[PDB]
Every structure is written in C-alpha cells, then in structure tokens.
C-alpha cells in the first residue's frame, strides 16, 4: 500500500520508488554487473533474515517471485545469480544481463501484507551520459483543419529518440509571457532505442492563427544541441 | 516576471470552493495578458477561460461563469478563486499566471502545481524516516545506491526535494500516476557518481509545503 | 508642510510610504519636513468624500494623488475628491484618468496629472502629421464627450497650419454601418485613420472595417494610452501606432513620477515667499486659498529644472510635460517599435517603422 506501480517501468527523476539506485537505470549492456541495491533499513527484521521478495513483470510474463526471504532460493526460477544478504544490505550482483534479465526487478517488502513494489531499474540502454546522447527529430507536424476549426487544436511535434527526463518545454518566442501550452506526454519504451512520443494540445484558433507571426521553439536537449526549429507563419493547415 | 509563484492548495475539501493562491507578483495588472487558470488535466485538452481587466469584468465564458464565480483583489494584487464543486476533471495542474494573447509559447514550467482535493485522511501521516546507510560494497554499474527512505507522508504534490537544490543536476519531470493509498514514496535522487556512494549519503529533504512538516532522514 | 494622499490599493500606499520615507529629500536642497499621510478609498463614493473632506482639508494638506484604477465611481476618474477640493485651490492630481474635459482649467479650477490626455495625444498626432504632409486626413472618432474636444483642437491645429481638413466630424458612437464612410475615404487624399474613442467604441470601427476588408496599405492608424488593451488588439489591424508614454503604463513608476513633482512643486514654493497653509476645512468655514493662482502659476507657469522625468518645458495647462515617448509598434504583437517622439521633434530610432501594408518605406499614405 505504501508502494504501487507507476506510470512508466524507469523510476525516473521523481518516482515513487525509493529502493532504486541511479534516477534513469544502470549502465549494463552484457556481461557486467548490475547491482540492484534494494536496502531498507525499516522495521521488517522481526528476529531473523530481512523477507525480501523481488520480482519482475516485464510484458508477457507474469510476475513470478524470484527468491523468498533473500535466504533461501524458491523452487521455480533458474539460479542465475547469486541473491543473499542478511539484515539491511542485500547482495543482488546481477552479473549476466541477458534478454530475460532486462526487466524492473519489484522489490516486494515481504513483511508487508499489502503486495508492494520497488526497484524499477530496468537493465536498457541510457543515452544520458557524455558518451550516450539522444537526440531526437526537429520537424513540426502541421495541426490539422479540423483541430483549428473546433478551437482546442493541437500541435504536435515529432520527437521519437528522448526520454521522459528529457523534455524541454522552456520556450523562448520574443519575449512571450504566458504559462502553460504543452505537457510531458510519453509512451511506452523500447529496449532498443528508447523510443517514446511527445505530443501537445496547444489550443490554437483561426484569430489566434491570425494574429501569430513565428513559432520558434527550443527542442534543445542534452543531446540536441542544434535544434532546426520551425518558425512557420499562418496558413499552415 | 518570474516572480509569479503559482501556490497550490493541497488540503481543501473535495467537492467544495477552491480558493486557489494566485500570486501576482510583478508588472501592474492593466488588461495587458489573459491573467486565467489553464486547466491541464490528461484526457483532456485546455479550455480558454477569459481574462480579466484593470478593475476587474470577469471577461471568462458563459457556460463556466455561474458555477465558477471569478474574484478580482486588486488592493493586494492577488486574487482568489471560487472554483465549487471540484470533480475528477477539474482537480489538475493549474496554471494561473499572465497569459500573452496570442499563443505564441509560454516560458514558464510545463509541470503546473497539482490542487489535490484532500484532507486530514490516511493519505497523509507522519514521515516514518528510516536509518539508510550507504554500502560502500556495491557497485550498480556506473551509478551509485543513493537515496532516501522516507514513507507516510503528503503524497506527490509535496515539494520534496535534493539537498539544498541549487544546481539540479538531475532535477527533471517525469510523468507519474498518483497512488490508490494516498501514501506516497516520492524520493527525489540527482545522478551522483559511483565513487560518491558510501563516501557522502544523500537523503532527500522531504518538505510539506501544505502540513509543514520539515522531518526527513 | 502637511501633505495627504488618497489611494485605494495596498500596493499604491506601500508605493507612497516607500517614496516619502526614502529618496524624499533628494528633489533640491532643502531639509524638507512634510507630513505624509493616506487615507484609503471608500466603496462608496459620498462616503470617501466626506472622509477627504473631514481629514484632507481638515488637516491642511497642500497636495494629493489619485492612482487607483478601480475607483468607486464606476467611471475611472476621480470625481467626489476632486468636486470637494476644487473650491480650496487643491491640485488634485487626477493621473489616474485621461479625459481631456476633465484636463481643461474652465469647469476644474486646480486639477492636474502626469497622464497625457486626448489633447496631448491629439497634438502628437498633429505633430507627427507635418512630418509627411498629412494635411488631407480624416477623423473616424465616434466618441462625443471628448472626442468633441478632440475634434476641435484638431481642426484648431489645421487652420493654425495654414490648411483643412475634410472630415472632421462624428458619425455614431459605436456603429455598425459605417461602410458608407469607408468607401468614400477608398476614395479620398489619405487613409490615415483617426480613431480616439474607448474600448468598446474603437473594437465596433476594428471590426467594421475588417469585415470590409480595411487593411490595405497607407492605412496609419493613431491609438492611444487605452484604447488597445485586453480583446482589442486583435479587432485593429496588425501594425497599428501604439503611443506610450514614460511612466504611464506602470503604477509604481507614475506614482513615483507624480511624488517626484509634488516634492519638486514643494521645493518651489519653499524657494519663494509668501508661504501660507490652506484654510481648514471646519464646519461654517468658507474660506479662499490666498495662494491658489500664484500655485497654479507655479505648477503650470513654470519649469522644472529637476525630478522623476529629469525634463524641461513643462505645459502651460499641467496636463504631461513633453518628453520623450515610448511608441512601440503592435506588429502581430511583438516587441518592434517605430518612430518615438522626442517632446521636441520624432527622432527615428534603430529599427525602422514598419507597415502592415507590406513593406517598410513610406507607404502609398
């Protein structure tokens, strides 16, 4: 109850998972260790080994419990690491990422009744260090008649390589003081790529068309330094 | 112009007038901007609710007017909001701020201020802060095994945040759902080095801005 | 020395106790001991005049200011303060509204402002119409209360300027059917519109004229201080003459303006002779300022060497002392600017003025 599942499978900047390690995930692609440090050191040692029961729940398989107690291995998942610990630090040394050992590992507080959860490093790539960048695209989707027709439209920009950290809605269009036309929409995330979409409801009428000269925006990212914003005038339907 | 604090309330009733704190702070209100509160809910695109003139003529539409009674407070440059009835929809990220007309791009934030529509209920209860230490026997990677464990507390509209946050070095916005228990475990972590686990601990400063509730550890 | 202040706003008296408590004794040299006071604006209108007239006059105060855009009268100006003080000699500073009938000396004895009326914006327009022979121009003010008076200093301007216009004169205070003018002006010398009415009666001409398709080029259109705010700005044509004028559009700052001439009309009269508190303002007391047209003569007669605007040549009618303007251009509402008015002569700054007609050179006017 004091832990649930979460919107994306990344903890991110603000989750609510406070087991997890790094913000984003770990920086393992194969054949490193990935340590999923999922300490607590809560009221849970009531005279004996600390119950913690991780699982995973990537899509397609349902959530199995890997090790019981972190003491003791349970019948049913291969032994392909190494799971022990007793008080508050648990060793989880995850060394072989492979393609089944690539899913948020839900640290279960086992002396909770309640099924909770934890962890959510997913074991993918991150292309927000110096080395890894992601940039994504820079052209702007036209809204359509209809949308400018009904008052509410939405213009949708096309951003396909970026992460839900990473989303610059800081915009600059001479001097402009207004709050609020756009939000943090994200999708479902690839383990190739991380492949998400941005979208945006800005509201934008035929007189507010009218009267809108440019639309240069920032889409300046960490890995998109140079964004070609287009600075389209009206017209544009 | 960036003075413009939007302040909102987390502990009203549900279902009952929302009195939302519009902080004004800044250039003089002359019918200027579109000074409106954008509601922002997911599902949902924002409806253009008016503006307000130099003394106030509640120029917003007419289907959200008799409901939705806007105030004008010029003595104090901050007025308030009669929003009754709060439904699901209408409990979202408000924007309440001035507005070029136009729609030319906004300059603020994009994340909003959450007015959760709660109470002295089970949602929120006292910080059960918890002895974390830091393992210097582990390596996750190139990251480290920071963090807080900070539970029972104001849920995700709480304003928890880093250590002294000057620099926000890995403050950023991630879309999040909010919990059926009300006890949220938002625990804010910057990314820290590897060699900085075990060396230095980091526990996130957990501050209520509704309860005032400065305890984190 | 007892100095009163009427403002409504908590922010305007913050504004008021800042700039009598610190930077006070700057304007000039004299060690200066005035007494600053404010009395806050009743929602009722016959209520705030009998508190003005049982502590203003009551506790010989020689000078006042009315900032506050929500006055009780529901008419933005102020009309019971300056109704009651009128008969002292008073000069009741009346910055907060822009009538040109209530700027001029024959019904309102002492009234002045730092706010340039109709008169003032009108004798802009005048001045920036000799500059590329505007002679032939047409007035499409629909207002009748000022734009009466407007209409009179303009043709007063163009006989005085050795010609005349060809329409000068009101049709309808916001009308619908003014297509008819339209398209005879299609026809006429220059297209420069001349519009000095409210909101709403300049929106219904906006609209008029772009359901007529009025936006062609040669179209210089003359607004004022409030006549583009809010909704308007989208029924007038992209590229309209927004006049601004220093210290006009912030409170704070014209408040701070209008105490700067208050201690600076102050210091004046310190440096003279004859100085003599007004009469109080006691029950059967029906008493005269002595000093009231040598005030006048002071405050409008006169120059200011210092203060706020750090200008010279003040009017003769205290109604804004010529200075340097602040025109910023309305182009699809961007921060472009053309042409500004230097009190003496429009000096052309770095960017050039554009039209809506398309280019930016002298257009077909």
């Known amino acids: 109850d004091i832990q649930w599942v979460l919107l994306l499978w990344v903890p991110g900047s603000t989750g609510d998972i406070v087991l997890t390690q790094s913000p984003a995930s770990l920086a393992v692609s194969l054949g490193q260790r990935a340590t999923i440090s999922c300490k607590a050191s809560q009221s849970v040692d009531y005279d004996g080994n600390s119950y913690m029961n991780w699982y995973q729940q990537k899509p397609g398989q349902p959530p199995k419990l890997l090790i019981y107690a972190a003491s003791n291995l349970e019948s049913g998942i291969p032994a392909r690491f190494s799971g022990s610990g007793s008080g508050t630090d648990f060793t989880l040394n995850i060394h072989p990422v492979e393609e089944e050992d690539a899913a948020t590992y839900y640290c279960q507080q086992g002396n909770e009744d309640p099924p909770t959860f934890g962890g959510g490093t997913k074991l993918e790539i991150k292309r927000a260090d110096a080395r890894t960048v992601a940039a994504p695209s820079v052209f702007i989707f036209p809204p359509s008649d209809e949308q400018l027709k009904s008052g509410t439209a939405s213009v949708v920009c096309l951003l396909n390589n970026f992460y839900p950290r990473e989303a610059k809605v800081q915009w600059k269009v001479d001097n402009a003081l207004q709050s609020g036309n756009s939000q943090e929409s994200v999708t479902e995330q690839d383990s190739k790529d991380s492949t998400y979409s941005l979208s945006s409801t800005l509201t934008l009428s035929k007189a507010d068309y009218e009267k809108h000269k440019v639309y240069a925006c920032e889409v300046t990212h960490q890995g998109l330094s140079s964004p070609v914003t287009k600075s389209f005038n009206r017209g544009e339907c | 112009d960036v003075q413009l604090q939007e302040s909102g309330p987390g502990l009203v009733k549900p279902s009952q007038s929302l009195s939302l704190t519009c902080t004004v702070t800044?250039?003089?209100?002359?019918?200027?901007?579109?000074w409106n509160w954008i509601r922002q809910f997911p599902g949902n695109k924002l409806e253009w609710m008016g503006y307000?003139?130099?003394?106030?003529?509640?120029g917003y539409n007419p289907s959200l007017k008799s409901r939705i009674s806007i105030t004008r407070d010029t003595s104090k440059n901050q007025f308030f909001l009669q929003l009754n009835s709060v439904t699901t929809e209408d409990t979202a990220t408000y924007y309440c701020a001035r507005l070029y007309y136009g729609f030319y791009g906004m300059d603020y934030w994009g994340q909003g201020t959450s007015v959760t529509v709660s109470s002295a209920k089970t949602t929120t209860k006292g910080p059960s802060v918890f002895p974390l230490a830091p393992s210097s026997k582990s390596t996750s990677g190139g990251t480290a095994a920071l963090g807080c464990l900070v539970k029972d507390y104001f849920p995700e509209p709480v304003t928890v945040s880093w250590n002294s946050g000057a620099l926000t070095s890995g403050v950023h916005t991630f879309p999040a759902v909010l919990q059926s228990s009300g006890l949220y475990s938002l625990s804010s972590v910057v990314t820290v080095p590897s060699s900085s686990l075990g060396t230095q601990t980091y526990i996130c400063n957990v501050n209520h801005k509704p309860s005032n509730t400065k305890v984190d550890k | 020395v007892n100095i009163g202040a009427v403002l409504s706003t908590r922010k305007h008296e913050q504004m008021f106790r800042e700039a009598v408590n610190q930077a006070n004794k700057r304007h000039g040299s004299w060690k200066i001991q005035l007494n600053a006071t404010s009395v806050t604006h009743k929602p009722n209108a016959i209520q705030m005049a009998l508190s003005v007239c049982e502590d203003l006059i009551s506790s010989q105060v020689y000078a006042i200011l009315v900032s506050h855009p929500p006055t009780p009268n529901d008419h933005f100006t102020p009309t019971p303060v300056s109704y009651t003080a009128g008969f002292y000699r008073i000069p009741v500073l009346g910055l907060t509204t822009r009538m040109s009938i209530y700027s001029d000396k024959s019904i309102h004895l002492s009234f002045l402002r730092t706010v340039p009326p109709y008169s003032h914006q009108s004798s802009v327009w005048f001045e920036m119409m000799r500059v590329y022979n505007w002679n032939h121009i047409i007035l499409l003010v629909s207002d009748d209360h000022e734009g009466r008076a407007a209409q009179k200093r303009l043709e007063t301007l163009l006989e005085e300027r050795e010609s005349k216009a060809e329409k000068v004169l009101q049709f309808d205070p916001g009308t619908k059917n003014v297509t008819a003018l339209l398209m005879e002006a299609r026809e006429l010398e220059a297209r420069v519109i001349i519009l000095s009415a409210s909101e709403d009666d300049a929106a219904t001409v906006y609209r008029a004229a772009a359901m007529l398709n009025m936006t062609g080029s040669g179209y210089v259109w003359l607004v004022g201080e409030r006549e583009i705010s809010g909704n308007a700005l989208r029924y007038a044509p992209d590229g309209i003459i927004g006049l601004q004028l220093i210290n006009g559009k912030n409170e704070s700052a014209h408040i701070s303006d209008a105490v700067g001439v208050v201690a600076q009309a102050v210091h004046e009269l310190l440096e003279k002779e004859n100085i003599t508190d007004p009469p109080r303002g006691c029950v059967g007391n029906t008493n005269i300022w002595k000093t009231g047209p040598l005030f006048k003569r002071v405050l409008m007669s006169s120059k200011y060497a210092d203060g706020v605007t750090g200008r010279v040549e003040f009017n003769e009618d205290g109604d804004r002392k010529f200075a340097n303007y602040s025109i910023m251009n309305l182009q699809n509402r961007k921060l472009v600017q053309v042409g500004i008015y230097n009190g003496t002569h429009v000096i052309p700054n770095d960017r050039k003025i554009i039209w809506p007609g398309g280019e930016t050179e002298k257009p077909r006017g």
């Open positions: 800044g250039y003089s209100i002359t019918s200027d901007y579109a």
């Open positions: 307000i003139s130099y003394s106030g003529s509640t």
